[PDB]
Symmetry: C3
Subunit: 114 residues, 3 copies
């Protein structure tokens, strides 16, 4: 799994430990080993949500499987909770796009997962 967060929150507001917490909690939530979890945090972005530049986040989660109705609702509660707690971003100013990737469409280690 691969999680990306883009936010206008300043880099200094990103707490020590944040990447590791995302790695560990996403490993739990998706049921995949932590060694395969990739996380990417992009602070200080020029963005608006609803025409306002108050804190907001635009995110994505790509996973080979483990994507669906109930699972995505769970991921959103977990991730919005983390963004609210750690970056002080309001949940209703977060978007998360979920992608269920075909193993043939994911490259890794000179090949693909198919």
């Amino acid at each position: 799994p691969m999680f990306i967060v883009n936010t206008n929150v300043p880099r200094a507001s990103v707490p020590d430990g944040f990447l590791s917490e995302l790695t560990q909690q996403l490993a739990q939530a998706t049921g995949k080993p932590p060694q395969y979890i990739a996380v990417h945090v992009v602070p200080d972005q020029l963005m608006a949500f609803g025409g306002s530049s108050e804190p907001c986040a635009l995110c994505s989660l790509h996973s080979i499987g483990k994507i669906g109705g109930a699972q995505n609702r769970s991921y959103s509660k977990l991730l919005c909770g983390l963004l609210a707690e750690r970056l002080r971003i309001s949940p209703d100013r977060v978007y998360i796009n979920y992608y269920d990737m075909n193993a043939a469409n994911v490259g890794w280690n000179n090949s693909t997962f198919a």
Copy 2:
């Protein structure tokens, strides 16, 4: 809806008002309320289009519905027009990827937009 612009145009060339104009014109174009429109502009990028580092942009628009043949052509005319006018980027050096997102695959406000079944 969510619109992202990545460009090698410098931040100083992004005009006052640009995010708001994108927000409002996208609300108008998609028929979605302005409150739900998110915009993200990323200047000063290291990128090339056709091997040339002349001004270019790589963009995406994600929407739950309102994606399709004629609508996407209309979005492209609007967005290329804005990028040409405001950032001075040639329309033929712009790519825009359109994504029709399923409501169940979009997170917001502690949940998703699939609130009908559980």
Copy 3:
């Protein structure tokens, strides 16, 4: 086609001519002409792979067609080889997401690549 590389490798470690080399290698690999290849490299990123902040890359390749099982395997060998050689990133710390785009879902030059129907 559009290739994006996001990495925690520093900007100064990105060799001059990297974007041009990616352009040429991708044109060759996809069969699409160089003029239509777009490349974007984003260094100095805050990211981890498997919990480690050693060099890694998260990438995407979008193409209208020319995406699939065998071809994606070939692309991965090519792109990982390039990232390993040029950016000194180990192949098992690289992810590449492949996207087969519909022509109607790619905007360019004030329209899309769906020019056949109205």
